[PDB]
Design a protein around this nucleic acid. Sequence first.
RNA 1: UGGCUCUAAGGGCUGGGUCGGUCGCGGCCGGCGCCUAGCAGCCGACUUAGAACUGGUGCGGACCAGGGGAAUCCGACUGU
RNA 2: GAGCUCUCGCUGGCCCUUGAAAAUCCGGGGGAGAGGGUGUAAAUCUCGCGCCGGGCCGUACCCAUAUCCGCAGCAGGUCUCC
RNA 3: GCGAUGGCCUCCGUUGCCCUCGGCCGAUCGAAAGGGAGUCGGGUUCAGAUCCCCGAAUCCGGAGUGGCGGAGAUGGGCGCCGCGAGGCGUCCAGUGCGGUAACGCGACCGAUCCCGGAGAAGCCGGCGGGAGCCCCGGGGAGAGUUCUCUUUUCUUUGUGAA
Lengths: 91, 114, 135, 69, 94
Amino acid sequence: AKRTKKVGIVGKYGTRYGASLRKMVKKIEISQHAKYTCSFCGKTKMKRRAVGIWHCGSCMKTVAGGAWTYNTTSAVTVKSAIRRLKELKDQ
Amino acid sequence: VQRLTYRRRLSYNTASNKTRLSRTPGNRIVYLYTKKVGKAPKSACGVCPGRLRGVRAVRPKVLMRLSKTKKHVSRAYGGSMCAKCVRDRIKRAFLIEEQKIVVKVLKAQAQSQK
Amino acid sequence: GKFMKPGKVVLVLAGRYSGRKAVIVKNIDDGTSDRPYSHALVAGIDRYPRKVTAAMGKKKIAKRSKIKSFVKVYNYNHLMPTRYSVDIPLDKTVVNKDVFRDPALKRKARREAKVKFEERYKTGKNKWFFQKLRF
Amino acid sequence: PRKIEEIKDFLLTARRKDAKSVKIKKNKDNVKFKVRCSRYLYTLVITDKEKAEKLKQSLPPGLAVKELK
Amino acid sequence: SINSRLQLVMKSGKYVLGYKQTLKMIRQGKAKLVILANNCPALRKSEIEYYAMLAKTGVHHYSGNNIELGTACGKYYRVCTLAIIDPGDSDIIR
RNA sequence: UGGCUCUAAGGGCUGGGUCGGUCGCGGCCGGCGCCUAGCAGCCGACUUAGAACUGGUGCGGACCAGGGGAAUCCGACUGU
RNA sequence: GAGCUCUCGCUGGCCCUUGAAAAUCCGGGGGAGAGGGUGUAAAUCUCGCGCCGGGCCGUACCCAUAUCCGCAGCAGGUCUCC
RNA sequence: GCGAUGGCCUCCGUUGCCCUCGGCCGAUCGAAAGGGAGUCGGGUUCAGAUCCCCGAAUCCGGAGUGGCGGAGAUGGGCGCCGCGAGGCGUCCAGUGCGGUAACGCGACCGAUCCCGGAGAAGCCGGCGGGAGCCCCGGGGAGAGUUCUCUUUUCUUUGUGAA
Ligand SMILES: [Zn+2]
Ligand SMILES: [Zn+2]
């Protein structure tokens, strides 16, 4: 809040595009541009290369994830369900 | 100030029409058409961003004129793969072969027990 | 305990002989004031014998059963130890650290290592050491 | 062109069958001998003057050693 | 828990942090225990396991990743593989 | 808001291993000073602020170079 | 000398945009196969030289308030470099 | 592998047959600004000159007999002769060498097959290196002013590809 009160990243859009639309965009704009922690090296190098594809600067590992987030809640849920079904089937 | 023109008929400034300034013994600045900057071969691993060392970065058709020693390095996978990934491949191959031998021994022991 | 012994076999991970199998003939692992890092003098094989397949004969079998050896000092970080060990004599009078200063002495060491490796390749002993690493 | 550091190498180059006119240029302590060949013009730079004068007499076959002036 | 034993080792015992130094210590034969994080590269993990098999040294696979291993060891950086040479008064070695 | 005369501030490079011994001002060795508050010399691109004096109150002196405010209707806007 | 232009090299930001194909050249894994047998040879992705050849078509000028298109030596239009 | 001619039917080339091997992916056209190996300097005509002349290069293709040198190269052991250097007979190895390493040395056998790289890459911002031009303090050469001043102001003060 040093410079802007409640816009931050969406301050580049200025007065345009509507306050509610900018507020809705802000979450995605922060999430896609935020660098995550790579769970291969432990470094904060996971950067969104393109839509749904993330790249590690150090590991050079490319992971197919969400469009704006590294891991989506739907992906986590489906992974857990698939693991549970695999364990149930194999016993 | 001496203003200079193109010495060819390609007036458009394109990739093939790049020039540089050069001073002649006649004491007049002229244009010399420079060749494109070649890049050294990249590692076949596909993981290391850096390019291979010990090899000249020149055009592929100039690689034909270049001698054999300039186009590679004296090593296994020399001039085609980086030393780091080469040694990683060596140790990975050794460890996988040892693990396969161990698995085969365990399977034989299980067959003998059964 | 320590497992870098003059009977051990190592895989060279760097240099011109990358991927070659060698037998340690000397280990230092303390320093020399000229080679401070822990190291070991080894004798390896530059060229592995080719397959025979028994549909070969005599002269061609002899031609195939050829070994090109080398003698080299390597850092411990450039060697890959293994379970296997080769009980090759490799008389220390010829293979030493002084051969690396005189080309003739290194030539004699290479010749001696080649002779010993060729005479041990036959009889079907330590056949894993005489097979090139597929990587 | 190629510069030659040895007078013996220069003589060997000038003794070639394909060799031709070898000119001498006195360049005020930078005297040079330039021998023309099929591919390269081989140059030899002599700092000494008496050495160049002696080398002037080393042409075997009576070539085109005519000087430059 | 392994975290308390690791803390006691760091406070009193002798430890080596890293991969190259740990491998050199194992080769020299001084390292008595090795600890590998779960997020360790598989190639490095197999290399360490083979070295410890040759040197007759125990290996423990830490539950946490390299960051958690560093936090448990008390270092603000991240350590993937750890060597324990001589613990002071802990029972980290069985 | 001009002109002229000044002031202050914003920097780089080199230099002490000096005393003794020894070898050919230069090199080596020993304990020294260790500028550890830095000083001495040599160079260089522009600025910013301030002060006085002065011109017939003229000074972004030619050129470049936004007229603003209170409201209504329509279209969000950019664009076509 | 944040001086103008060109070039090279690092470093970043943007995409619900991810930003070309092929001719051609080169490197690497393998040893199918060749060599002479103790002074020589097969090979030289030819190391330094030496010999021969490279055929066909355009090549002037204007490129714009007069050499182009607008009925014209038309205040119009026409893609670039210094 | 078989058959035949040709040329010192030694040796090689050629075609004919047989055996053998073989993925490609669509014939062809499609850019004088895309990719695309390799030429620059000086001189020269009334009018053309990276094209002509001179001087330096470079790329591709050919090179059978291979035109030369050099790398595969002239090592060790055994038994003799010889004071010695050295010479003879016999067993052999010898598709190179060095550096811990990144890698290097003028070469340094190699097929069908397979993998990879270059070709082959958007827009914008910042910084740094190099060059061309501009600037200043001077040396020279030629020069305008000099009714007064101005160590004066104006032009020039270089090197190609490989
Ligand atoms: Zn990572
Ligand atoms: Zn790699």
